[PDB]
Motif scaffolding. Structure first.
Motif, short mmCIF file in Angstrom:
data_model
loop_
_atom_site.label_atom_id
_atom_site.label_comp_id
_atom_site.label_asym_id
_atom_site.label_seq_id
_atom_site.Cartn_x
_atom_site.Cartn_y
_atom_site.Cartn_z
N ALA A 189 36.00 47.14 43.92
CA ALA A 189 37.00 45.02 44.23
C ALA A 189 38.04 45.31 43.25
O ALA A 189 39.30 44.64 43.57
N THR A 213 40.09 41.77 45.68
CA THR A 213 39.86 40.76 45.93
C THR A 213 39.75 40.04 44.99
O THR A 213 39.97 39.96 43.85
N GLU A 265 38.23 36.90 42.42
CA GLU A 265 37.80 37.02 41.84
C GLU A 265 36.60 35.84 41.82
O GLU A 265 35.44 35.99 41.43
N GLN A 284 34.98 36.01 44.56
CA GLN A 284 34.09 37.61 44.60
C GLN A 284 32.58 37.57 45.23
O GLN A 284 31.28 36.84 44.28
N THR A 285 32.41 37.96 46.57
CA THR A 285 30.44 38.25 46.35
C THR A 285 30.06 38.57 44.84
O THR A 285 30.13 39.64 45.43
N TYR A 310 30.86 48.31 42.60
CA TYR A 310 31.44 47.55 42.80
C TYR A 310 32.44 46.86 42.21
O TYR A 310 33.45 46.28 43.15
N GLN A 311 32.64 46.99 41.05
CA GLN A 311 33.91 46.40 40.46
C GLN A 311 34.70 47.74 40.58
O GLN A 311 36.10 47.06 40.67
#
Length: 48
Positions: free
Chosen positions: A37, A42, A44, A47-48, A33-34
């Motif tokens: 990201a 995206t 922060e 950030q979902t 995920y990170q």
RNA sequence: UAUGUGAUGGAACCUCUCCGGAUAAUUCUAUCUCUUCUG
């Protein structure tokens, strides 16, 4: 688009053991995920 | 901390033996993101 969140009410179920590999898979996905990201640029704050 | 008519210890090289070596093109396209409410 988020409109409604989910809350988990308690139920009377017997605990179930968790396999060792589950935490390894969680670790793999949580670096995924990170990494995605940063490579997707995206926000922060949002950030979902 | 000696004991006395007798001390070449300056009387002895930590010496000898051993390739910081091996393998690697500074290259490049498929999504990302989960809750929507009877429709």
């Amino acid at each position: 688009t988020k409109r409604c969140e989910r809350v988990f009410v308690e139920i009377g179920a017997k605990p179930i053991p968790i396999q060792p590999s589950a935490r390894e898979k969680f670790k793999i996905l949580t670096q995924e995920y990170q990494k995605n990201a940063k490579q997707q640029k995206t926000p922060e704050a949002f950030q979902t």
